[PDB]
Design an enzyme around this catalytic site. Structure first.
Site, PDB file in Angstrom:
ATOM      1  N   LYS A  44       8.321  -5.791 -15.063  1.00  0.00           N
ATOM      2  CA  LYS A  44       7.004  -6.051 -15.617  1.00  0.00           C
ATOM      3  C   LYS A  44       7.079  -7.028 -16.769  1.00  0.00           C
ATOM      4  O   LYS A  44       6.070  -7.294 -17.402  1.00  0.00           O
ATOM      5  CB  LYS A  44       6.427  -4.731 -16.139  1.00  0.00           C
ATOM      6  CG  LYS A  44       5.246  -4.121 -15.385  1.00  0.00           C
ATOM      7  CD  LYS A  44       5.437  -2.587 -15.288  1.00  0.00           C
ATOM      8  CE  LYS A  44       4.257  -1.777 -15.883  1.00  0.00           C
ATOM      9  NZ  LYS A  44       3.160  -1.424 -14.945  1.00  0.00           N
ATOM     10  N   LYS A  85      -3.051   2.347 -16.265  1.00  0.00           N
ATOM     11  CA  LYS A  85      -2.753   3.205 -17.368  1.00  0.00           C
ATOM     12  C   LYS A  85      -2.628   2.478 -18.697  1.00  0.00           C
ATOM     13  O   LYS A  85      -3.057   2.977 -19.703  1.00  0.00           O
ATOM     14  CB  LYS A  85      -1.484   4.004 -17.078  1.00  0.00           C
ATOM     15  CG  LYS A  85      -0.980   4.862 -18.227  1.00  0.00           C
ATOM     16  CD  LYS A  85       0.223   5.626 -17.756  1.00  0.00           C
ATOM     17  CE  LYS A  85       0.291   6.914 -18.471  1.00  0.00           C
ATOM     18  NZ  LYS A  85       1.601   7.602 -18.259  1.00  0.00           N
ATOM     19  N   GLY A  89       1.553   3.227  -9.024  1.00  0.00           N
ATOM     20  CA  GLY A  89       1.047   4.570  -9.138  1.00  0.00           C
ATOM     21  C   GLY A  89      -0.435   4.530  -8.946  1.00  0.00           C
ATOM     22  O   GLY A  89      -1.001   5.396  -8.319  1.00  0.00           O
ATOM     23  N   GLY A 127       2.577   7.597 -13.746  1.00  0.00           N
ATOM     24  CA  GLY A 127       1.961   6.822 -12.675  1.00  0.00           C
ATOM     25  C   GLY A 127       2.149   7.402 -11.277  1.00  0.00           C
ATOM     26  O   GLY A 127       1.185   7.589 -10.542  1.00  0.00           O
ATOM     27  N   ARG A 128       3.396   7.682 -10.912  1.00  0.00           N
ATOM     28  CA  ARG A 128       3.697   8.206  -9.588  1.00  0.00           C
ATOM     29  C   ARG A 128       3.392   9.695  -9.493  1.00  0.00           C
ATOM     30  O   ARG A 128       3.792  10.387  -8.518  1.00  0.00           O
ATOM     31  CB  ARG A 128       5.131   7.919  -9.201  1.00  0.00           C
ATOM     32  CG  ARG A 128       6.109   8.516 -10.115  1.00  0.00           C
ATOM     33  CD  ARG A 128       7.468   8.071  -9.818  1.00  0.00           C
ATOM     34  NE  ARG A 128       8.443   8.617 -10.740  1.00  0.00           N
ATOM     35  CZ  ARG A 128       8.734   8.054 -11.891  1.00  0.00           C
ATOM     36  NH1 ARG A 128       8.082   6.945 -12.246  1.00  0.00           N
ATOM     37  NH2 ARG A 128       9.656   8.592 -12.689  1.00  0.00           N
ATOM     38  N   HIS A 155       9.552   5.372  19.769  1.00  0.00           N
ATOM     39  CA  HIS A 155       9.606   4.261  20.720  1.00  0.00           C
ATOM     40  C   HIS A 155      10.114   3.141  19.861  1.00  0.00           C
ATOM     41  O   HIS A 155      10.163   1.998  20.286  1.00  0.00           O
ATOM     42  CB  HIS A 155       8.225   3.933  21.370  1.00  0.00           C
ATOM     43  CG  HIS A 155       7.680   5.007  22.281  1.00  0.00           C
ATOM     44  ND1 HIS A 155       6.779   5.964  21.855  1.00  0.00           N
ATOM     45  CD2 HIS A 155       7.879   5.252  23.596  1.00  0.00           C
ATOM     46  CE1 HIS A 155       6.481   6.776  22.855  1.00  0.00           C
ATOM     47  NE2 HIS A 155       7.126   6.360  23.925  1.00  0.00           N
ATOM     48  N   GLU A 190      -0.563  -8.117 -12.571  1.00  0.00           N
ATOM     49  CA  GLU A 190      -1.316  -8.324 -11.375  1.00  0.00           C
ATOM     50  C   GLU A 190      -2.656  -7.547 -11.367  1.00  0.00           C
ATOM     51  O   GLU A 190      -3.635  -8.054 -10.858  1.00  0.00           O
ATOM     52  CB  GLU A 190      -0.439  -8.147 -10.120  1.00  0.00           C
ATOM     53  CG  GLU A 190       0.420  -6.894 -10.070  1.00  0.00           C
ATOM     54  CD  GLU A 190       1.790  -7.058 -10.692  1.00  0.00           C
ATOM     55  OE1 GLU A 190       2.010  -6.566 -11.810  1.00  0.00           O
ATOM     56  OE2 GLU A 190       2.663  -7.641 -10.042  1.00  0.00           O
ATOM     57  N   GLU A 235      11.342   6.022  -7.232  1.00  0.00           N
ATOM     58  CA  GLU A 235      11.144   5.522  -8.588  1.00  0.00           C
ATOM     59  C   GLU A 235      11.533   6.617  -9.593  1.00  0.00           C
ATOM     60  O   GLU A 235      11.913   6.343 -10.715  1.00  0.00           O
ATOM     61  CB  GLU A 235       9.712   5.023  -8.797  1.00  0.00           C
ATOM     62  CG  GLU A 235       9.359   4.720 -10.244  1.00  0.00           C
ATOM     63  CD  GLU A 235       7.937   4.247 -10.435  1.00  0.00           C
ATOM     64  OE1 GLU A 235       7.112   5.034 -10.929  1.00  0.00           O
ATOM     65  OE2 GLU A 235       7.642   3.088 -10.099  1.00  0.00           O
TER      66      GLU A 235
HETATM   67  O1  PA5 Z   1       5.079   4.037 -11.639  1.00  0.00           O
HETATM   68  C1  PA5 Z   1       4.751   3.145 -12.407  1.00  0.00           C
HETATM   69  O2  PA5 Z   1       4.859   3.316 -13.597  1.00  0.00           O
HETATM   70  C2  PA5 Z   1       4.196   1.850 -11.933  1.00  0.00           C
HETATM   71  O3  PA5 Z   1       4.118   1.966 -10.541  1.00  0.00           O
HETATM   72  C3  PA5 Z   1       2.751   1.758 -12.374  1.00  0.00           C
HETATM   73  O4  PA5 Z   1       2.030   2.566 -11.459  1.00  0.00           O
HETATM   74  C4  PA5 Z   1       2.181   0.348 -12.266  1.00  0.00           C
HETATM   75  O5  PA5 Z   1       3.024  -0.576 -12.933  1.00  0.00           O
HETATM   76  C5  PA5 Z   1       0.774   0.243 -12.856  1.00  0.00           C
HETATM   77  O6  PA5 Z   1       0.805   0.539 -14.263  1.00  0.00           O
HETATM   78  P1  PA5 Z   1      -0.596   0.599 -15.062  1.00  0.00           P
HETATM   79  O7  PA5 Z   1      -1.122   1.951 -14.648  1.00  0.00           O
HETATM   80  O8  PA5 Z   1      -0.248   0.632 -16.507  1.00  0.00           O
HETATM   81  O9  PA5 Z   1      -1.339  -0.676 -14.718  1.00  0.00           O
HETATM   82  O1  PA5 Z   2      11.479  -0.779  23.409  1.00  0.00           O
HETATM   83  C1  PA5 Z   2      11.088  -0.027  24.289  1.00  0.00           C
HETATM   84  O2  PA5 Z   2      11.596  -0.078  25.384  1.00  0.00           O
HETATM   85  C2  PA5 Z   2       9.984   0.945  24.074  1.00  0.00           C
HETATM   86  O3  PA5 Z   2       9.549   0.729  22.762  1.00  0.00           O
HETATM   87  C3  PA5 Z   2       8.804   0.525  24.924  1.00  0.00           C
HETATM   88  O4  PA5 Z   2       8.196  -0.542  24.216  1.00  0.00           O
HETATM   89  C4  PA5 Z   2       7.751   1.619  25.069  1.00  0.00           C
HETATM   90  O5  PA5 Z   2       8.353   2.825  25.511  1.00  0.00           O
HETATM   91  C5  PA5 Z   2       6.644   1.234  26.050  1.00  0.00           C
HETATM   92  O6  PA5 Z   2       7.193   1.051  27.368  1.00  0.00           O
HETATM   93  P1  PA5 Z   2       6.213   0.527  28.538  1.00  0.00           P
HETATM   94  O7  PA5 Z   2       6.123  -0.945  28.220  1.00  0.00           O
HETATM   95  O8  PA5 Z   2       6.956   0.707  29.813  1.00  0.00           O
HETATM   96  O9  PA5 Z   2       4.988   1.418  28.500  1.00  0.00           O
END
Ligand code: PA5
Ligand code: PA5
Lengths: 554, 554
Positions: B518, B210, B158, B271-272, B388, B216, B357
């Site tokens: 967590k 929070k 979040g 958070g979210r 593409h 992390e 979530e």
């Molecule tokens: O949605 C959530 O609760 C988690 O994504 C938190 O965003 C994430 O774990 C970070 O939490 P905190 O804000 O306590 O560090």
């Molecule tokens: O997979 C495909 O064919 C497409 O993603 C091509 O990569 C995209 O259209 C690009 O084509 P070109 O290489 O002829 O420009």
């Protein structure tokens, strides 16, 4: 008709309908004490190791056997030799499918209509080697006599995902190289936001298009060129600032690039398989041709493994089969790829084109319609971010989601005595453990009891804290993420997608769904022009066009 | 039990089982000549317009009516007042759900346990206004007396997606502001790659957590701090380089940040759902508080619309219902969000946490298990890249994928007399047209006949070029992508996710799946330490740990 008419296929249906309950991961781990040893594959490239651990899958020995039987019976082995031998397995376009010739480090002759293709491959490669050496060293100078500091790739789709994914991933190997930029969307923002920081004197544009007629690719190319000529003012200055990666020389020439500046590839190189060709100039350029050569080698090793190893112990094969299991028998619509590596942050997206543009088909080799499921929906973000994001659903939602977990054992930035990677490892081990075992009511009840709450309090909380588990995963663990291994990793999935197509009897190498979107808009374009209302469509399409016009003036 | 026991719900089941064939888009467009007018919603914020066109959905008037009836009968309206009135609808955590109080531009008193929360909201806001003004102007100086040139946000989930998504999207509004960086993954790479370009003298770190205990988040915070003190050498220098966004003061203090440098929020901010709170410092800081205030206003308008508009013509409501239709009746596992705007490139990802979530739950308010589907799998990439890439599957794969198409009518970079945006518009109009109408065998046959091929040639090609169509989509078209509108857009989906949870009777505001990840890894961490083998787990988890150890030395 093909698949569902198959004896081994039909045999699986009954066993499945019959044992589904027998399929519990927790119990399966009691049963076999070295389940791990029986459902794991250790490959040693001699430039590192890749561990494919497929034990946490709702699968048994008999199932594995039956799954191998399916592949055998449906022509996987010879389909495979056809591919390597240069036959035209791209049946609707009537083309050979030879991305493997691009990394054919051994220069074994591979013929298409009699002619060996290798001499052409190696030629374009040497052109790449010298162009790289010249630009990287500073010998290649710009119109005001300056050195190149920025390379700008312009292309979309196949001509886009590869180079970006790889450069982002091979970041550490790029110190001596110029910066790369990737402009792909037609959206003026994309091109506008890049140029407004570049200096035309030291910049180089690469126009990557196989047909050299892709709308968005070509108009970005021109917008770039106009921006460039405002400063350079001399048309011949173009020759030192623009190069092309195409198959159509004429068009390359009609656009004004010097034929000496064209690096070519062949119609037998599919877009979503072209990073290994001239399309990779941007990688070699940013990371050195030596490492590029090493990328190609890694893919060469895996090509060799795919081709000569028996199915029961063939990485790509196994991976394809466990997927057909989930898709055609359990019914799962998707498949998550979850790399625990920040450098690999565009990996998942790459395979979206990789898997989905290849296998999202519904017509057979016989021209029949499928009456079974095909390519899944592939998504993901690197961990552990994902865990703080959508894992809640993987753990406690109402759908099954097989997942690939990937991680290197050695990190490129062992900061703080490797504490960081240590925590990233522990997290990579436990999510799959937890997705496996879960947590029963009792388990959680006791825990609550321990937190000292009281049964009347926690009576209503309890169920919400229960985890069913029994959710399947692959774990892919490799020694270090270097060019070689990354080569081998991509090539691995490449073959996985291949085996599946064979088993589903479809064409994994055309993409009419794509070929069509490339025409569809041609009629809408001119209509947007005036402020006068359109009526030539459905009331929606018209309704929309009209909101647009009235609004653009607002 | 709840949903599937519902009279209106059961009524839908039979109609569906009964008319499914009657549901063809092509024909539906013949039938009603102003289908567009009947299945479209035009909202005018007075700071622009948003067109919600839901006509290309396999839906009719009676279905819409029946769907509204479902929402009414399941307490959508009052569930909604409970939310606004500050009641604790977060039933497992026993919390109020008040992200809407954060953008309550009218300062209407909203009470939680008697106390109005608004005075606290506005307070933290003024603190944000002055801190912004000071840093943006250059008055706030670093330890060597320098101005800040880089702001570095540290947090995950979040505390991560919002700020990034919004800054990437509000890019144009950022000229006068310092650069932002977002470090979230534990992966040492993430932190290593950022610092190695920063100068500690002019850099500022924001620790957004929070609880202020996220593993992390906190170890990135320390690694940052150690890097910083190598140069600064004076511990008090920290006070000018580190700020915190948390609810836990004590922890903030035990980490060494000055309490005058803490910007707080409340446990009732999920958070979210926190970009609207102190968590958004990074946005206001990079884009100016004025535009931040404008973001909040946009969300304020939509909050107002959600609350006072009748269900039949209520954007969030409609959007939630068309989804329940696809999920509980047609069976679709996912939902794609496809913005035709490069700036919005992280939009889809944001809602992955947003939707998934929130709604990937399986226990009811009654403590019962669901016996129906819940939150879908949400994915996507901006167009036209997607086309593409994975559109081939959307067009010709074997699964149904409802899609949201989004685009602004006015682009922020009208380069080349607006040619770019013009092509981006035409493409945004035709994919949905095409996904609708498709192309029959005859249509393609004739086309082939015209290309002058001959029936024996094209006999085997034909089927592969057929498109079934009848694939549903929403089109969301707004005047311009500014802070205001973007505020309104996000807030829109926010409410969509809300209505669905109510109808499915689940808790959209906790995330035990997340709360658990967590904790899960705490036991694995110490085990990785030696070179001695582990045996305390399943053979897989052990197998893996051991490969790791043997390897780390390789
Ligand atoms: O949605 C959530 O609760 C988690 O994504 C938190 O965003 C994430 O774990 C970070 O939490 P905190 O804000 O306590 O560090
Ligand atoms: O997979 C495909 O064919 C497409 O993603 C091509 O990569 C995209 O259209 C690009 O084509 P070109 O290489 O002829 O420009």
């Amino acid at each position: 008709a093909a698949l569902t008419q198959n004896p081994q296929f039909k045999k699986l249906q009954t066993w499945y309908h019959e044992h589904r309950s027998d399929l519990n991961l927790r119990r399966l781990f009691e049963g076999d004490k070295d389940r791990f040893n029986h459902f794991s594959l250790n490959l040693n490239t001699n430039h590192g190791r890749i561990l494919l651990d497929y034990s946490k899958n709702l699968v048994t020995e008999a199932v594995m056997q039956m799954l191998v039987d399916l592949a055998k019976s449906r022509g996987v082995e010879a389909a495979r030799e056809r591919m390597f031998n240069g036959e035209k397995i791209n049946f609707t376009e009537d083309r050979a499918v030879l991305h493997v010739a691009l990394r054919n480090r051994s220069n074994t002759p591979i013929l298409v209509d009699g002619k060996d293709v290798m001499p052409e491959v190696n030629r374009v490669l040497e052109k790449m080697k010298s162009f790289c050496k010249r630009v990287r060293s500073g010998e290649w100078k710009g119109y005001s006599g300056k050195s190149i500091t920025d390379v700008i790739n312009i292309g979309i789709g196949g001509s886009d995902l590869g180079p970006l994914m790889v450069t982002e991933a091979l970041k550490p190997y790029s110190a001596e190289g110029p910066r790369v930029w990737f402009v792909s969307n037609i959206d003026g923002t994309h091109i506008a936001k890049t140029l407004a920081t570049l200096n035309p004197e030291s910049s180089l544009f690469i126009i990557a298009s196989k047909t050299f007629t892709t709308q968005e690719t070509i108009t970005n190319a021109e917008t770039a060129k106009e921006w460039f000529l405002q400063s350079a003012k001399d048309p011949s200055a173009v020759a030192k600032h623009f190069v092309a990666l195409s198959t159509n020389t004429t068009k390359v020439k009609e656009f004004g690039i010097d034929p000496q500046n064209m690096f070519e590839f062949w119609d037998w190189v599919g877009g979503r398989y072209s990073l290994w060709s001239a399309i990779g100039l941007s990688i070699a350029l940013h990371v050195g041709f030596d490492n590029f050569e090493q990328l190609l080698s890694g893919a060469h090793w895996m090509d060799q493994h795919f081709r000569t190893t028996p199915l029961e112990k063939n990485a790509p094969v196994l991976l394809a089969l466990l997927g057909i299991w989930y898709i055609n028998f359990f019914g799962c619509e998707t498949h998550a790829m979850l790399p625990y590596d920040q450098y690999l942050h565009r990996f998942a997206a790459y395979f979206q084109q990789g898997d989905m543009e290849s296998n999202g088909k519904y017509i057979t080799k016989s021209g029949t319609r499928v009456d079974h499921q095909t390519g899944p929906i592939v998504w993901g973000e690197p961990g552990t971010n994902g865990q703080h994001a959508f894992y809640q659903l993987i753990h406690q939602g109402t759908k099954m989601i097989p997942c690939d977990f990937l991680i290197p054992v050695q990190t490129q930035h062992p900061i703080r005595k490797g504490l960081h990677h240590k925590i990233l490892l522990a997290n990579f081990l436990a999510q799959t453990e937890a997705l496996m075992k879960g947590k029963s009511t009792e388990e959680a009840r006791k825990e609550l009891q321990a937190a000292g709450k009281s049964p009347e309090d926690f009576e209503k909380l309890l169920p919400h804290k229960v985890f069913e588990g029994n959710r399947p995963t692959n774990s892919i663990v490799f020694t270090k993420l270097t060019p070689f291994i990354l080569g081998a990793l991509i090539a691995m999935y490449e073959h996985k997608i291949f085996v599946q197509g064979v088993i589903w009897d479809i064409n994994s190498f055309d993409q009419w769904g794509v070929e069509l979107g490339k025409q569809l808009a041609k009629k809408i374009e001119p209509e947007l022009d005036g402020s006068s209302p359109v009526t030539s469509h459905d009331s929606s399409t018209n309704g929309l066009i009209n909101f647009i016009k009235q609004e653009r003036e607002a």
